[PDB]
Design a protein around this nucleic acid. Structure first.
Length: 49
RNA sequence: ACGAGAACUAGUAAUAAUUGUCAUUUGCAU
């Protein structure tokens, strides 16, 4: 419940990732999943499963 | 025909000699 979590932000440190080789890269469409499905006109590249 | 008249307070040598504008202190927490 935001217990001074902004202060602990400085006391928790995350290093960046190691590289991601291409073969795990693929393109996906944005899907608006509601009771009837709809597509978003553009795509986003994503990391594969 | 003046207790007068002559007569460079002159010559030699410097501000020198050893010293550092240094000693610590994250362009930092989203």
């Amino acid at each position: 419940n935001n217990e001074k979590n902004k202060d602990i932000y400085s006391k928790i440190k995350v290093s960046d990732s190691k590289p991601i080789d291409e073969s795990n890269l693929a393109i996906y469409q944005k899907i608006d999943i509601n009771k009837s499905e709809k597509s978003m006109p553009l795509y986003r590249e994503c990391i594969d499963v």
